[PDB]
Amino acid sequence: LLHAADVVLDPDTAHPELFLSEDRRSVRRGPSRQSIPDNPERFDCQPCVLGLESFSSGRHYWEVEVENVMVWAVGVCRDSVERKGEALLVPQNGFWTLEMFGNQYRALSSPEKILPLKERLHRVGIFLDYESGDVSFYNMRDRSHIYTCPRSPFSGPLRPFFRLGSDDSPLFICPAFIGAQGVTVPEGGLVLHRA
Amino acid sequence: TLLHAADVVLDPDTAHPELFLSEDRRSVRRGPSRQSIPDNPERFDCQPCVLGLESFSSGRHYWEVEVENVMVWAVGVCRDSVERKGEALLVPQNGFWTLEMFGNQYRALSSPEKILPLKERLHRVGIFLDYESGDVSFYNMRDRSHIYTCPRSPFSGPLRPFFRLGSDDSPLFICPAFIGAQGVTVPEGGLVLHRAE
Amino acid sequence: KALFQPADVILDPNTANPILLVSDDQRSLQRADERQNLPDNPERFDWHYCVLGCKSFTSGRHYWEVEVGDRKEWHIGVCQENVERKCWVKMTPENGFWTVGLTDGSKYRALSDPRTKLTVANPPQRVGVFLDYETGEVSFYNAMDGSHIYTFPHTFFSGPLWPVFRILTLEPTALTICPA
Amino acid sequence: LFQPADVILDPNTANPILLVSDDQRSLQRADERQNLPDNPERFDWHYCVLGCKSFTSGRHYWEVEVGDRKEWHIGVCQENVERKCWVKMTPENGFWTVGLTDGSKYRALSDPRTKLTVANPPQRVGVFLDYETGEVSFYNAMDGSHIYTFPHTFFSGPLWPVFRILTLEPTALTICPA
Ligand SMILES: C/C(=C\COP(=O)(O)OP(=O)(O)O)CO
Ligand SMILES: C/C(=C\COP(=O)(O)OP(=O)(O)O)CO
């Protein structure tokens, strides 16, 4: 049974130069910078931000819009992560991500494992099967498979992972479909609801 | 509270004789002839429809359907109790909450009065279900935008996905749920651009 | 000899939807970004963004005033103790909900089946809810100038009645109950 | 120098998607997982089934009829392996297996996976075990070609012949009688 995860970011986990929205479902990097207290629950040197809800079982997935963003790195990381310093976010450190760099897509976010995608990704999905070591990424335009990371033996809880090295445009996390929740449905129903 | 991406598989026992299903039962066409199948009480005999297998009676579920190049189609949720025989209208009173394309337009509740003024053509449509909310919604999966939410309904009984194919042009593809690398060997360098059958 | 009994209504936090925020004096109601982690006890409106008062009415005539102010969305009134609280039900007298309110800041409605479109000359900043259990009356007034707003078709009341408050939007103005 | 073994498939260890023959010699796959009990001996994640008899010591060999199968993996595994979630089939995790994927990629299921260069695709593979020496070797049972052999390892506990198929193809995976 697949779970359409509703991923909202955790500002504790967030980086002191990333600026979350009020819903905490978007992130962007600008010239001004936070200067928040660098506690142990957060990242400091490399621009990162984690989702609050951490998974420990089952199948979970979520979508992310990256339209008109130059450098990004979406994926999944543990809850037992290293949060201080600037280590490599490579599966050995507990970080399985899909990234963009130099108008190229690199698996495991290491320079030589480059993915041969024939179209630029505007919205990608991030799949996770805990009991399978499965961390996969999808091209949500045609729902086609992009890359599945080398299967990892999962020790404890993992949580969504986000990294923005691009100052140009914000990175959007697609919320789960909520239907008409919190909204009055007229006698004829809602038509093309926006906000 | 939690949204379940459903893995919908068509029920061939409910499939109209003019409906030809694939071997995976995740797509259906309208064939040139009829299949000469039994008229069991579960099968639609006059209107060309087929339901999903697993029914819902609580929680949030949703599935995506590729309806590209289909001129006459209708999808949504219906009651497990709805009458299969006859030509009754696919309206909420009869147990059908449907989004339909008819006459190159989009009609909610299969009603000529409720024309949906969409200016974009739908290619993949998501069917949202929230049982406790009486909520049956629809989404344009290209931009994840909202299409239409049907009037809230006290369902009172199990509900099943609903599909009506009215054209013989192109099939109706029900997108399976993401399963990652299930049943597939992930190489040492990782599984790159997997395309299955 | 008294005309009615003025009700000193305080919000019951144990009935409020997990998305509602009850003040410390239990007079103001506000919404939150997402639902809180509160137990799903039977008295709690799990689906509707509703909250009850602490004391009910079994008989008599009662009246209280609610300050709505600049709020763009709000709905108040009474309801029976046996109302459905764990899933959606259309808040109508048929389902035991006598409620009126405002949506989209401009469309005033009496929540009946179907909803009745109300024409309000002066937008009420403070609404008064009148209840007559003996004659089955549920009446709504503009508390500032005493002008009538809407009255539901009189019904045979069964069970106790609760002051119910419903807000769907997050905004600066809060739904506040005026003390007796 | 290796005792011939009469291996049969144990259905109670079979993945719910694997089909065991009536003679417990052939192994196929179904369209979907079957509704079977989840007894602690059954494989739940991996598409694996064991033999009915184990090997606590000695020198044994059995031959597997792989035929035209474009995907198959055979070998042995310790009894103390995890069968209800995913484990990397590796000697470190108690798995000594070789096989074929994609019809042309012959690999030894080690860490890292050693890519075998098989001159002629075997139609019948022979599994050779040597407990006290710690040798696991696979040969071409027809023309005797050595395919691959695992480095020496000190075996712990019993050993079971393990068979894993992932694809749904006509030709089945059959065990040759002894
Ligand atoms: C979302 C919600 C209630 C909406 O109910 P409805 O959909 O019936 O709309 P209304 O006519 O204003 O009552 C939670 O209280
Ligand atoms: C699908 C599956 C096992 C695939 O495992 P892997 O993905 O680790 O691939 P391999 O290195 O050949 O073992 C179920 O047996």
Numbering used by the authors:
A (entry chain B): 325 to 519
B (entry chain A): 324 to 520
C (entry chain C): 334 to 513
D (entry chain D): 336 to 513
Give the authors' words.
Vγ9Vδ2 T cells—a major subtype of human circulating γδ T cells—respond to multiple cancers and infectious diseases in an MHC-independent manner; they are specifically activated by small, non-peptidic diphosphate metabolites called pAgs. The sensing of pAgs in target cells requires a surface protein, BTN3A112–17, that has both intracellular and extracellular domains. Here we show how—in both humans and alpaca—multiple pAgs function as ‘molecular glues’ to promote heteromeric association between the intracellular domains of BTN3A1 and the structurally similar butyrophilin BTN2A1. The BTN3A1–pAg complex functions as a composite interface that directly binds to BTN2A1, bridged by the pAg molecule at the centre of the interface.
We observed a similar molecular glue behaviour of pAgs in alpacas (Vicugna pacos, Vp), to our knowledge the first non-primate species known to have a pAg-reactive Vγ9Vδ2 T cell subset. Alpacas possess three butyrophilin molecules: VpBTN3, VpBTN2 and VpBTN1. Among these, VpBTN3 accommodates pAgs and is required for γδ T cell activation. HMBPP, DMAPP and IPP (in order of activity) promote the association between the VpBTN3 butyrophilin full intracellular domain (BFI) and VpBTN2 BFI, but not with the VpBTN1 BFI. A structural analysis revealed that VpBTN2, resembling human BTN2A1, shares conserved residues (such as Arg475, Thr508 and Val509) that are essential for pAg-induced association with BTN3A1. A VpBTN2 BFI variant with mutations in these key residues abolishes its binding affinity for VpBTN3 BFI in the presence of HMBPP. Thus, in both humans and alpacas, structurally diverse pAgs function as molecular glues, enabling the formation of a composite interface between butyrophilins.
